[PDB]
Ligand binder design. Structure first.
Ligand code: AGS
Ligand code: AGS
Lengths: 344, 192, 7, 346
């Protein structure tokens, strides 16, 4: 049933700018389900576990891929958070609660829940930082999660009980997608491999050029680098598949403002349409916006700041203004040097 | 030998030399003949103090019998380029170039000791060679003499004709006469 | 309640 | 109908002065919020976006005043929370969820009426890391609460105790506004590092400070999201707040206007205090400007102005009750200095 060719096209409809990442997920997703079709029946013994490790910058679409995949996929999907997770459940939460929410989506169907997908956001949150210690969000969380990720049956009261019984739902079959933004990881990889600082005439020095630090550096990531970050090596050993996402290109940004149905121009113009005046954006403004956005280095999430701040003056006085049929925005408006000219 | 002193700080004790200790307080010493090496060291000191604090006055103590002219003109332009007021003081003696840097200090912040002495004369030189070369170097040193008199009048306030007549030969001026001549502002007899 | 650790 | 930006700003002008740049920002959000709440999830463009404001300004510039005045004219519910007590990872003290439970007291347990509410936070700068990207000891209000808040702004549902069965309710935050703003301390040093580019020793090194450069207002204006990363904020948290408002330091003229024009101007408050006693209080124009000059030297903002007035009239306030048959009291500019005593009218 799974198709790697079609799934890549489907993700392209909702995600843009990450072509390599789509290929990685299609292989792991196809392999994981194919394994369950014939479980441990092949001649090959000790088959490696198929897991996913999403790693990319902010606004790269980590949370977006989990949403799009859930809609396209038939099995139930869940969206949890690592910040809420706590060890030995004092007042925050428990690891077993993740399984309870999965059944609510699957309507207490063990046969249908074991084939489900799991996605945990902000994986970096559980990084073990116990230099000055007890720790409820550090080693305790990762230790409990590793036990679950290893594959074990955990007691879960079905429906809560009206019984003193619990179901032994398997865990090795269920898939897991550990993803989150890694801050400081680039420095760790750069610290290990620099291959520079040559003072000789023959030697070369690169101060601004960083050999595509946003994308190339991620491609050369190793498990040993994450160990210094705080993660446990056994946790990384269980995830042979890692996804690397490069920084969005200026071309990709333009596509994100036009092709998607959640585009800023579409919603903002729709909002202006309610007022009664149409909104027009030229192509020259779009490429200009992309350059400013990349400078901020905030991702797509910070794109809105440039568009809104530029239109702050226009929206403030637009209701008072009358007899304006359409609004025209030029490239200079993005810079802010020239005010936009209205159409009557 | 140079003695070593100890500066008490909040972090801990630090051993500094006498010359370096005073430099921290915007104080520079001009000793011996004016040459290219000693002059290049003072320029770095003035620039260093400018960055540390541009609103605090600098104090320059001068005790030297003079020296090369080109080495001294670098100090004059440096004092005027930087915003802080370079205070000057005369200790022992102030020769031709030593006197020019003394009067070049900030107006109202120039002091002379009660027993100090200033001496001013014309530039010294010489050359050996063809007659054509002597004319070239003679016109050049004449330009400097004219240039040095113009600036001397600017700071001292006197007229250009008076400075020329007074600098034709060695002219010694006591500390009181320097005040009347506009070379300095007052005398630092005692501490108040 | 909470945790304190410094030097 | 809904209020217009010009109409709401005319109301804010009565309580706020010299912050034109900030009034327009709050006006568009309120206008956008009502427009978002005007249509019943029906629009030409689906998935209407949410914009979060980040108020940044000097000390005593009027940030806390705007959130208070906004709730008066705002019809929808409003809450005034604080980031001081936020406890990430469920430690002792208040939790992020509390902000939602507090929003029901003003809404009177109305979920449909609560999702259309506005939220304001203060002292958001205080929860930033100490200019260090990696946290060593898992800061509860550093690398903690900042992350915890991400889920709420992004849009999720959190269980809240209905009363003080014991079942909980779910309320989404995807269509709830949040105004997180606080006076950042030490931000000027970071901005100077990235924009002055003139440090060093030398003839050709542009080093001019304490006279022209290092202006508080100019530095804040040139702020960018990349600058906050060096300060301690996480980029994820900054991504959820695209809008940024840069307030300025109160000018000498602004102080004079704030002394008389506001409804609750300090000059009027003291007059009310004196009015009940039975003695009128008048301030001579010349005297008012002198107070403004002293306030700027203190560098404490508008709040610091009270100190100058209190000291000037400290002696008169002590002797006013014991004195009798006093109709009017006049304060002169010399009285502010303290050399002279204000005249009295019998
Ligand atoms: N790759 C992308 N392509 C297009 N739009 C994107 C992309 N990434 C983010 N966006 C836009 O940003 C919005 C939020 O994206 P998110 O996926 O939540 O960002 P995020 O950084 O992945 O979140 P985190 O870091 O995992 S909590 C989306 O609704 C889009 O409008
Ligand atoms: N623009 C203004 N116009 C008039 N009065 C003002 C203005 N800004 C501040 N004030 C006065 O200062 C008082 C406190 O203002 P705040 O809103 O607390 O300033 P602030 O910037 O929020 O200070 P913080 O952030 O709490 S340190 C108000 O009650 C007013 O009396």
């Amino acid at each position: 049933l799974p198709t790697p060719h079609e799934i890549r096209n489907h993700l392209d409809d909702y995600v843009i700018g990450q072509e390599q990442a789509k290929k990685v997920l299609a292989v792991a997703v196809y392999n994981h389900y194919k394994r369950l079709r014939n479980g441990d029946t092949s001649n090959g013994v000790e088959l490696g576990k198929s897991n996913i490790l999403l790693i990319g910058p902010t606004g790269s679409g980590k949370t977006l891929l989990a949403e799009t995949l859930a809609r396209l996929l038939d099995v139930p999907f869940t969206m949890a958070d690592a910040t809420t997770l706590t060890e030995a459940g004092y007042v925050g939460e428990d690891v077993e609660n993740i399984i309870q929410k999965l059944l609510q989506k699957s309507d207490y169907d063990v046969q249908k829940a074991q084939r489900g997908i799991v996605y945990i956001d902000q994986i970096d949150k559980i990084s073990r930082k116990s230099d000055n210690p007890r720790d409820v969000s550090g080693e305790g969380v990762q230790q409990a999660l590793l036990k679950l990720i290893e594959g074990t049956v955990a007691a879960v009261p079905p429906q809560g009980g009206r019984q003193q019984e619990f179901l032994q739902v398997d865990t090795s079959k269920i898939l897991f997608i550990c993803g989150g933004a890694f801050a400081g990881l680039d420095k760790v990889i750069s610290h290990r491999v620099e291959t520079g600082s040559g003072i000789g005439f023959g030697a070369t020095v690169k101060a601004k050029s960083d050999k595509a630090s946003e994308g190339e550096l991620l491609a050369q990531v190793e498990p040993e680098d994450l160990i210094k970050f705080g993660l446990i090596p056994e946790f990384i050993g269980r995830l042979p598949v890692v996804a690397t996402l490069n920084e969005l290109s200026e071309e990709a940004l333009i596509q994100i403002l036009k092709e998607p149905k959640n585009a800023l121009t579409k919603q903002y113009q729709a909002l202006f349409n309610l007022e009664g005046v149409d909104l027009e954006f030229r192509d020259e403004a779009l490429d200009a916006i992309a350059k400013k956005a990349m400078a901020r280095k905030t991702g797509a999430r910070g794109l809105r700041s440039i568009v809104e701040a530029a239109l702050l003056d226009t929206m403030y006085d637009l209701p008072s203004m009358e007899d304006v049929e359409k609004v025209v925005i030029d490239e200079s408006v993005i810079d802010g040097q020239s005010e936009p000219l209205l159409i009557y | 030998l140079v003695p070593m002193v100890i500066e008490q700080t909040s972090r801990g004790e630090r051993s500094f030399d006498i010359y370096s200790r005073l430099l921290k307080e915007r104080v520079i010493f001009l000793t011996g003949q004016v040459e290219d090496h000693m002059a290049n060291l003072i320029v770095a000191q003035m620039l260093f103090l400018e960055a540390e604090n541009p609103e605090k006055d600098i104090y320059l103590y001068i005790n030297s019998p003079g020296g090369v002219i080109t080495a001294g003109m670098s100090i004059y332009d440096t004092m005027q380029f930087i915003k802080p007021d370079v205070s000057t003081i005369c200790m022992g003696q102030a020769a031709s170039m030593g006197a020019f840097l003394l009067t070049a200090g900030a107006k109202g912040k120039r002091f002379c000791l009660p027993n100090s002495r200033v001496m001013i004369h014309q530039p010294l030189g010489g050359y050996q060679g063809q007659a054509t070369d002597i004319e070239i170097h003679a016109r050049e040193i004449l330009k400097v003499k004219g240039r040095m008199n113009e600036l001397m009048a600017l700071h001292t306030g006197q007229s250009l004709e008076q400075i020329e007549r007074d600098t034709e030969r060695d002219r010694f001026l006591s500390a009181p006469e320097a005040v009347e001549y506009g070379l300095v502002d007052s005398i630092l007899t005692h501490r108040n | 309640x909470x945790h304190x650790x410094x030097x």
